[PDB]
């Protein structure tokens, strides 16, 4: 199994993932090969091209990855709540800054932050919520959305890279993932950051600073970031790892993943550690993950 690492920081974690498993997995056990590819769909073409074997995509990404004449399929899925009460999904939430007296109503001429183009909480869900209203010339969605906010950081797009000129993927700073959309909000975003619900607590273990932001709700109202089950834009399926439909290394892939979660799972400090890393935030898997269901 040749895991596809999306650029430098991920490449580094993969490197870590590689050698530890080499210390645990039988005198063989998959024993990975870190393939690096600047972007995710880059990793998609790589897998299909038989250049790679796997990657963990957002579920909006798992979707477009099923596109064409034979594209990939989900094989392993992460499950976010506990070990006690797993859970195969999360919530999209619109995170904003306390006191910007604007509601989901008036996103109007505001600047916003996203995770990336075509992801669940970062784009699919908020735009779904938002068009109709979006400028008629709704030709391109990207273009009515350009036309509708007035500053945005939508990584991996191409325009709306006004807050992260170039719209890159992970070596992008005040932009890119969850992590980075939220960083976009901490300065720069007309207090709109479309994330996941577990994002503020990842970044902020301080209640006081966390009392500095709120959520935007359908029920046209702002609320404390602690009660997101009551203010959350929508529910979303969950990140899965895709492997080719035919001839992928499915059972191998799950062989890897399932033994690498026993060592290196949620509760353990095996130098390695699956669901967190020093090279930054959500590399190879999401930090919020707890494990893997098949
Ligand atoms: Fe996601």
């Amino acid at each position: 199994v040749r895991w596809c690492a999306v650029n430098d920081h991920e490449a580094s974690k993969c490197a870590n993932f590689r050698d530890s498993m080499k210390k645990v997995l039988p005198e063989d056990g998959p024993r990975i090969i870190c393939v690096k590819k600047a972007s995710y769909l880059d990793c998609i073409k790589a897998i299909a091209a038989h250049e790679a074997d796997a990657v963990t995509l957002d579920a909006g990404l798992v979707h477009e990855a099923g596109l064409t004449p034979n594209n990939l399929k989900p094989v392993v899925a992460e499950f976010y709540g506990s070990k006690e009460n797993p859970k195969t999904f999360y919530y999209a939430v619109a995170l904003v800054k306390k006191g910007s007296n604007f509601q989901l109503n008036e996103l109007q001429g505001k600047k916003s932050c996203h995770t990336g183009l075509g992801r669940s909480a970062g784009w699919n869900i908020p735009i779904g919520l938002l068009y109709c209203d979006l400028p008629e010339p709704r030709k391109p969605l990207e273009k009515a959305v350009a036309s509708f906010f007035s500053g945005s950081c939508v990584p991996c797009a191409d325009q709306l890279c006004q807050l992260c000129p170039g719209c890159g993927c992970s070596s992008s700073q005040p932009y890119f993932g969850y992590s980075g959309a939220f960083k976009c909000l901490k300065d720069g975003l007309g207090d709109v950051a479309f994330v996941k619900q577990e994002t503020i607590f990842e970044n902020l273990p301080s209640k006081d600073e966390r009392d500095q932001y709120e959520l935007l709700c359908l029920d046209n109202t702002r609320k404390p970031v602690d009660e997101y089950e009551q203010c959350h834009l929508a529910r979303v399926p969950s990140h899965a790892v895709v492997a080719r439909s035919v001839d992928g290394k499915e059972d191998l892939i799950w062989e890897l993943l399932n033994q690498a979660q026993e060592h290196f799972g949620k509760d353990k400090s095996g130098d390695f550690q699956l669901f967190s890393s020093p090279h930054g935030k959500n590399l190879l898997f999401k930090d919020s993950a707890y494990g893997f269901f098949k």
Side-chain angles (χ1 to χ4, degrees), residues 121-137:
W123 179 259
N124 283 1
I125 290 210
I127 309 294
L129 254 347
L130 277 158
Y131 79 100
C132 253
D133 266 8
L134 319 178
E136 204 160 352

Side-chain angles (χ1 to χ4, degrees), residues 58-59 80 90 115 119-122 178 196 236 238-239 286:
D58 179 78
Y80 304 118
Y90 49 97
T115 53
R119 333 224 332 214
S120 307
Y178 286 132
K196 151 140 238 225
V236 152
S238 151
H239 286 214
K286 270 178 357 152

Side-chain angles (χ1 to χ4, degrees), residues 10-67:
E10 273 206 355
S12 299
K13 189 169 163 185
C14 178
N16 300 146
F17 185 19
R18 228 198 24 231
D19 313 321
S20 338
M21 295 292 317
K22 219 226 164 280
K23 267 141 196 90
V24 286
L25 225 34
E27 308 317 13
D28 214 40
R31 260 48 157 342
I32 348 155
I33 292 126
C34 302
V35 177
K36 208 185 88 188
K37 287 268 193 254
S39 130
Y40 73 87
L41 93 119
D42 227 76
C43 272
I44 297 186
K45 314 191 157 138
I47 293 174
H50 265 272
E51 261 122 50
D53 287 333
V55 71
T56 309
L57 297 196
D58 179 78
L61 260 15
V62 323
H63 173 245
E64 39 186 272
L67 289 230

